[PDB]
Each structure stands twice: as structure tokens, then as C-alpha cells.
Design a protein around this motif. Structure first.
Motif, PDB file in Angstrom:
ATOM      1  N   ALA A  92       6.249 -40.058 -21.389  1.00  0.00           N
ATOM      2  CA  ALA A  92       7.653 -39.790 -21.663  1.00  0.00           C
ATOM      3  C   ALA A  92       8.253 -39.011 -20.502  1.00  0.00           C
ATOM      4  CB  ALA A  92       7.830 -39.025 -22.979  1.00  0.00           C
ATOM      5  N   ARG A  93       9.579 -38.910 -20.509  1.00  0.00           N
ATOM      6  CA  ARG A  93      10.316 -38.180 -19.490  1.00  0.00           C
ATOM      7  C   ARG A  93      11.345 -37.277 -20.153  1.00  0.00           C
ATOM      8  NH1 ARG A  93      10.596 -39.694 -14.147  1.00  0.00           N
ATOM      9  NH2 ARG A  93      12.810 -39.114 -14.190  1.00  0.00           N
ATOM     10  N   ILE A  94      11.588 -36.126 -19.535  1.00  0.00           N
ATOM     11  CA  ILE A  94      12.620 -35.190 -19.965  1.00  0.00           C
ATOM     12  C   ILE A  94      13.605 -35.040 -18.816  1.00  0.00           C
ATOM     13  CG2 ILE A  94      13.142 -32.844 -20.696  1.00  0.00           C
ATOM     14  CD1 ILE A  94      10.455 -32.700 -22.023  1.00  0.00           C
ATOM     15  N   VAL A  95      14.871 -35.347 -19.077  1.00  0.00           N
ATOM     16  CA  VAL A  95      15.892 -35.372 -18.043  1.00  0.00           C
ATOM     17  C   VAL A  95      16.909 -34.265 -18.312  1.00  0.00           C
ATOM     18  CG1 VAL A  95      15.564 -37.832 -17.643  1.00  0.00           C
ATOM     19  CG2 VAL A  95      17.333 -37.053 -19.234  1.00  0.00           C
ATOM     20  N   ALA A  96      17.716 -33.972 -17.296  1.00  0.00           N
ATOM     21  CA  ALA A  96      18.756 -32.963 -17.403  1.00  0.00           C
ATOM     22  C   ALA A  96      19.890 -33.455 -18.299  1.00  0.00           C
ATOM     23  CB  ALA A  96      19.288 -32.595 -16.020  1.00  0.00           C
ATOM     24  N   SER A  97      20.693 -32.499 -18.771  1.00  0.00           N
ATOM     25  CA  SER A  97      21.869 -32.660 -19.628  1.00  0.00           C
ATOM     26  C   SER A  97      21.526 -33.131 -21.038  1.00  0.00           C
ATOM     27  CB  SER A  97      22.921 -33.610 -19.031  1.00  0.00           C
ATOM     28  OG  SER A  97      22.469 -34.953 -19.040  1.00  0.00           O
ATOM     29  N   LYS A  98      20.255 -33.393 -21.342  1.00  0.00           N
ATOM     30  CA  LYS A  98      19.814 -33.729 -22.699  1.00  0.00           C
ATOM     31  C   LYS A  98      18.489 -33.003 -22.925  1.00  0.00           C
ATOM     32  N   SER A  99      18.578 -31.761 -23.400  1.00  0.00           N
ATOM     33  CA  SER A  99      17.392 -30.932 -23.601  1.00  0.00           C
ATOM     34  C   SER A  99      17.767 -29.793 -24.537  1.00  0.00           C
ATOM     35  CB  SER A  99      16.866 -30.401 -22.272  1.00  0.00           C
ATOM     36  OG  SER A  99      15.746 -29.557 -22.468  1.00  0.00           O
ATOM     37  N   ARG A 100      17.050 -29.675 -25.652  1.00  0.00           N
ATOM     38  CA  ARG A 100      17.279 -28.594 -26.600  1.00  0.00           C
ATOM     39  C   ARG A 100      16.311 -27.433 -26.420  1.00  0.00           C
ATOM     40  N   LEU A 101      15.483 -27.452 -25.377  1.00  0.00           N
ATOM     41  CA  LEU A 101      14.480 -26.419 -25.160  1.00  0.00           C
ATOM     42  C   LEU A 101      14.842 -25.451 -24.041  1.00  0.00           C
ATOM     43  CD1 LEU A 101      12.888 -27.781 -22.449  1.00  0.00           C
ATOM     44  CD2 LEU A 101      11.916 -29.184 -24.280  1.00  0.00           C
ATOM     45  N   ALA A 102      16.117 -25.393 -23.642  1.00  0.00           N
ATOM     46  CA  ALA A 102      16.618 -24.489 -22.601  1.00  0.00           C
ATOM     47  C   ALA A 102      15.872 -24.710 -21.280  1.00  0.00           C
ATOM     48  CB  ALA A 102      16.539 -23.024 -23.052  1.00  0.00           C
TER      49      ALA A 102
END
Ligand SMILES: Nc1ncnc2c1ncn2[C@@H]1O[C@H](COP(=O)(O)OP(=O)(O)NP(=O)(O)O)[C@@H](O)[C@H]1O
Ligand SMILES: Nc1ncnc2c1ncn2[C@@H]1O[C@H](COP(=O)(O)OP(=O)(O)NP(=O)(O)O)[C@@H](O)[C@H]1O
Ligand SMILES: [Zn+2]
Ligand SMILES: [Zn+2]
Lengths: 413, 413
Positions: free
Chosen positions: A76-86
Motif C-alpha cells: 500500500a501507499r500513503i500520500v499527502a493531503s489524505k492522512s488522518r495520522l498527522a
């Protein structure tokens, strides 16, 4: 809890790490961070908290299949502007892979993509002189080769600034790179969708006048096949790929299927660069050979051939963790070699000799091998021999006559 | 507003530009125009007006997909007789490509196709003598090679007039070119539709008696494969493609898949021409080496080898923008080389030697290299060394014995 994972991610991001490893053995979970070039055991958390933070990190990713699938492999990938983990501001996007291990165990691997003086960071002066001649050629193709942690993007960004400054805005500078890398000229942004977007970008870049095309991560055979056409059309290409020894690059090209006739042109190829990254010793916190062997000094028999004749000039890491620096290592320097293509040199490789072409390049072209460049910095004491042997092989195989010739040129300059 | 875009297009068309670049950085938009051979920063407009004029220009194009698609890549064309933006008469049709950049930024590129003494515009007298022998051969194939801005169409149109005049209407002159180019003999006019129309035109041209077929932009492998059949059927072909160094053309042919036996015929191939375009210094506004170095003169070390022995004969651009000309550059001249094919020369290339075939052509055939032609004009002072180095590579690699032989032939004539 997601707050513990957010805090761990925040404290790991600010520590200037390379990769993150989390291993679960069903009783405890070990955390590893690739500080500088090697991983180190950070801590041992309990299993339930590790599983909770892994689930929280996986569920907060923008890519999910509505299931964890512990027995299966996940990416999986985690991108900017969509993240609830600060998410910390010093990272744009990261990729995280989950791998099962044993019975009910996990193996999380994170690549941790970051955001980020004129020239010669760690290169030799001959490399800088060769780069000056290489930048003046209006057409050609250059290759940057090395492992994953070889710092190819930094070298490309450093060369792009020199090309932008020296040309005095007489050429158009366009660069294509899907992940942004700090500030940089023009920059252009599932796996199949990403490949199709890259194909569309590279086939739309040639629609405009490219002058300098500046691609990145030539991974597909069709992409590099299309790139080679624009290389000989009358453009200049600066691309990077994964290779080693600065001569196996042609083997990679033949594996991709570029045919023998395209690589026989001396005018097309303009230069090959192979670089590795090795830890650099602290200048303030350094000890000699006698001081190192006075306190638990262990040196192998094969290493004594390398340090023979220059025992005083060599340096070793300073223990006890003094006030200066962190652990005796400040930054990571570059060991690189550059080969200028020639007609006879390319003809020898095209015949598949794989022998006496290296000798011809080393003798007639006055080139310098990667092992020779490593040995030159070993003599100067910039880097430790223990890391140089573990990162560069065949250092002890250099003949004494070659060592004398290498030392004479450095001493006379 | 569309009127601002129309006015900008009208003032850009009359300025005799090559390409138009519009870059948007979300705070300001930079305008670049390729005056002569290099781009120059025209102005910096604000973002909202730039977006408005880009939308107006895209919506007025005859090709549209009913959406702008800022995040995606777009390409369109604007043709004559269908334009609501008051298109200037000096252009028939243009192509415009939209490319996203950064976050909410645009990159517009326009190619700006234009409408438009007997011989030897910038060619050497040996080139003119070779062209006279080349035009008398009733059969064969000739190739014109160079980059995108090499002026191939102008050379083809100039040779077509000479062929029309010299033959005294004893042969049929048919030419095929989808975009008309001013006045020119017979002229014949999505991407897949254009390719199919070109295929139909080239397969219907051979139905008539071609004599001289005069094609253009041989881009497809099947098209050039069909063209090579008509070349050896007993016709004469004058086509142009993108290549360099006048010897990599055969590599392009082999990449297209024309096989080895078709290129081994010395009778089939009749000549290779490789040309580049370089800025020409003003004869009235010229300064010597001493006058150039007296006011901020910067010359590299490698350049002094080129101007060695002929310091007084060389010339430099005149600053301060005097009343004559515009910026010390008047027009753009041609640096070209022509190779006459031979049996031994083609046999050497067919073996894939890529070495000593150039030496055989340069010595036995008394040919002149592109670098040699550039150096000859450098000695005469027609063009500046700074542009010659940035456009032509390897000029400093010419031996002194070669320079003396080149100068003797020019001095004796
Ligand atoms: N002088 C230096 N030379 C090269 N790299 C450096 C230098 N100093 C710091 N670095 C590291 O360069 C890294 C920048 O990322 P980089 O290594 O260029 O990506 P990469 O080589 O393309 N890896 P990959 O995408 O996985 O193939 C930073 O993490 C730095 O730690
Ligand atoms: N003496 C000259 N010789 C060659 N070109 C000239 C000369 N004088 C002016 N030109 C330029 O020739 C250009 C005509 O278009 P041209 O360059 O022939 O198309 P092209 O080379 O086929 N480009 P492309 O279609 O993109 O591959 C004009 O823009 C002129 O600026
Ligand atoms: Zn220190
Ligand atoms: Zn003038």
C-alpha cells in the motif's frame, strides 16, 4: 492505538532514516531503522500493540482492499493531503509492504521517501573535469548506475543545476519525475496505472521540443527502446538505472533488447557513471592504527595488504561517543567512476570479450576503477577500511605497480 | 479574454518566431519565444489571465474533447478557414500541446508552422559541385538528415526548383506534402487518420508515372519499406528524416528494418546530406578578439585551441545593440556535409565496423566532415565560436595536420 503509531512515525521521520523494518515473532516485535547505510535495533515492543499499530497504519492508507489478509502479502501507499495520522511535513508519500512470517507474525517494510555545494560532493577532480566535457556535448545519452541506495537522484539534480546555469537559458530544460523531490527548469509528474501514466508522459514529452529530456528510472524495455530513438534523433538524455561495475550496464541494455547496432555508436553514448555510497569518518573524532589496536583493535589479514606502507595515514572510527558528531560518522560520501566511451572500447564490448577491454580502458584511456578510487580515499583516511571492504569488493587485488601509479598522480597534484 | 490571446498570437506571428512556450507556476506565467535558434524570456503575465487565454485558445481549436482536463495531457490543432480568433494570414495551421506541471500549473507548447537565391545558401562550393553530379543521375535515393530545426524542407524546396529547371520539362515532377509550404511541379496534400491518408497518398502516387517522387517525413517502417522498392524499381527518391553525423542514417534504416542486402548497393544510394543551422554574425556589426576581450571577454581554454593561429580573422558578436540589424545576428546559416556512396565505403558499414570507414571516406574520397566545415567558417569569421561549440561537438579534436590541409584547399581556391 493510532496515536502511538503516529508518534513513532513522527519521531522516525525526524531521525533522518532510510528504511523502516518491523518484525513480529508472536512474543515481541523488533524495530529496525536504516540509520545512514545500515540498520540498527531500535526497540522491542509487545505483540498486541504492534498488531494494533500495524492495523491502524494499514487502515489509514488510501489504498486498501477492505481486509487485512494476515496470511497473504500486502502492499500500500500513503500520500499527502489524505492522512488522518498527522503525517509529518518532511515526507510527501511512503510505500509500506506487509509480509507474513512464521505463524501469525508480520514483516512491515517502509521505504520512507523524503523531500530532499555547486559540484564535487565526493567525486574525484578527474570526474569533475570529465563532467565539464560531458555537459558541453549537445547530443548523446548518459547512464547513471548503482544500487538502490546509491544517491542517483541527488547526482542528477546536481547536474541539472549546472546544465541550467551553464547554458544561459539557450536550451529548454524539461524533467519528468512522478514523485517530487524538494525544489528543483521544468518538472513533470495500481502499478499498471502508474506505468500507463509514465508511458503517456514520456510519449507527450517528445511532442514538445525536448533539448534536454531528463527522464528517470528507466525500468521498461519499451520505454528505454523509445528513449534510444530520441537519443539518436538529436536530443540529449540523462537517465539512471540499476547496474554495477560501469560495464555490466551494456548487459542490462542487451537484456532489455536494444540490439547490437544501437550500442556500437561512439557518438551516441557520451559517458557511463557508476557510484556507491560509503560512510565517511569524522575528521575531529579520528584515531590512528596504534590507537585503534590499543583498545580492542581487530584487523583481518587481507586488510593489512591494503594498509601496507600507509599505516599512519589511515584513520579509524573513534569510540566512546564524544561530544562531537554522533557516532564518529558524519554524512555519507560517494565513491564513483566515470568511463568515457570510445570506438575501440565499444567494439571490444560488442564482441562480448569481457576481458582486455577493462585493461584497454584502464591503460589507454587513463581511466580509474571504482576499487582504485576506494583505495585512494583509504590512503587519504577519509573513510574506514572496514566499511570499504564490506561495500566494495576486490580492493585487495590491486597490484603494487598500480598502487604506485595511483599514488604518484595524487601526490603530484 | 480571447482578444488578449488573439493579440498575443498576432504579435508573436509577425515576430518570426520558431516555437512558443507558456509556463505557469501558479503565481506568474512566463512566456518564451524561440527567436532564431534559442528561446528568450518575453514577459511574465499573471496567473488568472494566463488560464483564461489558455482556455480560450483551447476552446477555439477545431479538435476538442468537450473538457479541459487540467490534470491530463492534451494535444490539439488549429487550422485555416475555421478560426474565431482572427488568425494571421502568415500561418496556415498550428499544433498546440498542453502539459500539466506542479500543482495547478500549465505548460503550453506551440510549433507555429509558417508559410515559407538559386543555390548555395550556406553550402560549400564542393557541396554545390556534388549536387550537380547528384541531380544528373536518373535513378537513386538521397537522404537529408538533421534535427528538427535543421531546415530540411527549405533545402528540398531549393533542390526541387533546380531539378525542375535543369530537366527542361522532360520528366514528371510530383511532390507529396500534407502541410502546404508557401508556393512551390505538382504538390499533393487523429494521428491514425493522418497516417492512413499518408499511406493512401503514397500508394496512389506510384500508380502514376513518378519519375521524381519527392516524398516527405519518412516516419513509418512500412512506408520506407515501400519507398525502397520504388527506389530500386527505376525511380528517383528525395526524402528527409531525422539523424546525425551522416553515418548513423544507416543505423536508423536498420532500426526501421530495411535488411542488410538492400543497403549494400552502391547504385541505389546516391548521396547522404547532413545539415545543421547556426546563427550567423552580422558583417557590419563585428568585433575582433582584442575588442571582445577589452569589454568583458570570456573565452574557455578549449576554445583557444580552435582560434590558435587565426586570432585576427575571427569575429565576435557586437554588443550595445547598434542601429544596424537587431542583435548582431542576421539570419541563420547552414553547416552541412555530403557523402557520396561507394562500394568499399558501404561494404565497411555493412560489416558494422563503425571505425576506419570514416577515415576511408575522409582520406580516399576527399570528403569534408561537419566539424571541418564548421572550423572553416570559424576561420573565415562568418559565425561565432561560442555558438559553433554549443551546436557542433568535437571541433577541438581536429588535428593540426588536418587543419593545414583544410586551409590550403580554401586558400588555393
Ligand atoms: N553527498 C551525498 N551523495 C549522495 N547521496 C547523499 C549524499 N548525502 C546524503 N545523501 C543521501 O541521498 C539520498 C537521496 O535519495 P537517493 O539516494 O538519491 O534516491 P535513490 O538513489 O534513487 N534510491 P531508490 O529510488 O530506491 O533507487 C538521501 O537519503 C541522503 O541520505
Ligand atoms: N538559409 C536557411 N537555411 C535553412 N533554413 C533557413 C534558412 N533561412 C531561414 N531558415 C529557416 O527554415 C525554416 C523553414 O522551416 P524548416 O526548418 O525547413 O522545417 P523543418 O526543418 O522540417 N522542422 P520540423 O518539421 O519540425 O522537422 C524557417 O523557419 C527559417 O527560419
Ligand atoms: Zn566527531
Ligand atoms: Zn549589424
Amino acid at each position: 492505538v493510532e496515536k502511538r503509531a503516529s508518534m513513532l512515525l513522527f519521531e522516525c521521520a525526524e531521525m533522518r532514516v532510510s528504511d523502516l523494518h518491523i518484525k513480529v515473532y508472536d512474543a515481541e516485535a523488533d524495530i529496525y531503522i536504516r540509520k545512514d547505510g545500515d540498520m540498527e535495533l531500535l526497540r522491542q515492543i509487545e505483540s498486541n500493540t504492534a498488531h494494533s499499530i500495524l492495523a491502524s497504519l494499514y487502515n489509514n492508507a488510501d489504498d486498501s482492499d477492505a481486509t487485512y489478509k494476515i496470511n497473504a502479502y500486502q502492499a500500500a501507499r500513503i500520500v499527502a493531503s489524505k492522512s488522518r495520522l498527522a503525517l509529518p511535513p518532511v515526507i510527501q508519500a511512503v510505500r509500506l509492504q506487509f509480509n507474513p512470517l512464521g505463524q501469525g507474525g508480520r514483516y512491515l517494510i517502509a521505504r520512507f521517501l523524503y523531500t530532499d555545494d555547486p559540484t564535487r560532493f565526493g567525486f574525484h577532480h578527474s570526474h569533475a573535469e570529465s563532467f565539464s566535457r560531458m555537459r558541453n556535448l549537445p547530443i548523446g545519452i548518459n547512464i547513471i548506475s548503482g544500487p538502490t541506495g546509491s544517491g542517483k537522484s541527488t547526482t542528477l539534480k546536481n547536474l541539472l543545476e549546472l546544465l541550467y546555469i551553464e547554458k544561459k537559458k539557450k536550451v529548454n530544460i524539461i524533467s519528468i519525475e512522478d514523485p517530487p523531490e524538494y525544489e528543483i527548469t521544468a518538472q513533470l509528474p495500481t502499478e499498471a496505472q502508474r506505468g500507463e501514466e509514465y508511458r503517456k508522459a514520456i510519449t507527450a514529452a517528445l511532442r514538445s521540443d525536448p533539448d534536454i529530456i531528463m527522464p528517470g528510472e528507466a525500468r521498461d524495455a519499451e520505454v528505454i527502446n523509445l528513449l534510444f530513438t530520441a537519443a539518436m534523433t538529436g536530443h540529449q538524455v540523462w537517465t539512471s538505472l540499476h547496474a554495477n561495475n560501469a560495464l555490466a550496464i551494456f548487459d542490462r541494455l542487451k537484456d532489455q533488447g536494444v540490439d547490437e547496432f544501437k550500442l556500437t555508436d561512439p557518438e551516441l553514448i557520451t559517458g557511463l557513471v557508476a557510484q556507491r555510497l560509503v560512510r565517511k569518518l569524522c575528521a575531529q573524532c579520528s584515531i590512528t592504527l596504534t590507537e585503534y589496536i590499543a583498545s580492542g583493535g581487530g584487523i583481518s589479514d587481507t586488510d593489512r595488504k591494503i594498509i601496507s606502507g600507509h599505516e599512519t595515514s589511515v584513520r579509524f572510527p573513534n569510540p566512546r561517543a564524544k561530544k562531537c558528531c554522533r557516532d564518529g560518522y558524519n554524512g555519507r560520501t560517494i565513491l564513483a567512476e566515470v568511463i568515457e566511451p570510445d570506438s575501440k572500447l565499444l567494439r571490444l564490448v560488442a564482441e562480448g570479450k569481457r576481458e582486455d577491454a577493462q585493461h584497454y580502458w584502464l591503460t589507454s584511456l587513463h581511466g580509474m576503477a571504482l576499487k582504485e578510487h576506494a583505495w585512494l580515499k583509504i590512503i587519504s583516511g577519509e573513510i574506514c577500511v572496514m566499511d570499504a571492504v564490506n561495500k566494495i569488493s576486490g580492493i585487495d587485488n590491486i597490484t603494487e605497480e598500480r598502487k604506485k601509479y595511483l599514488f604518484s598522480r595524487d601526490n603530484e597534484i
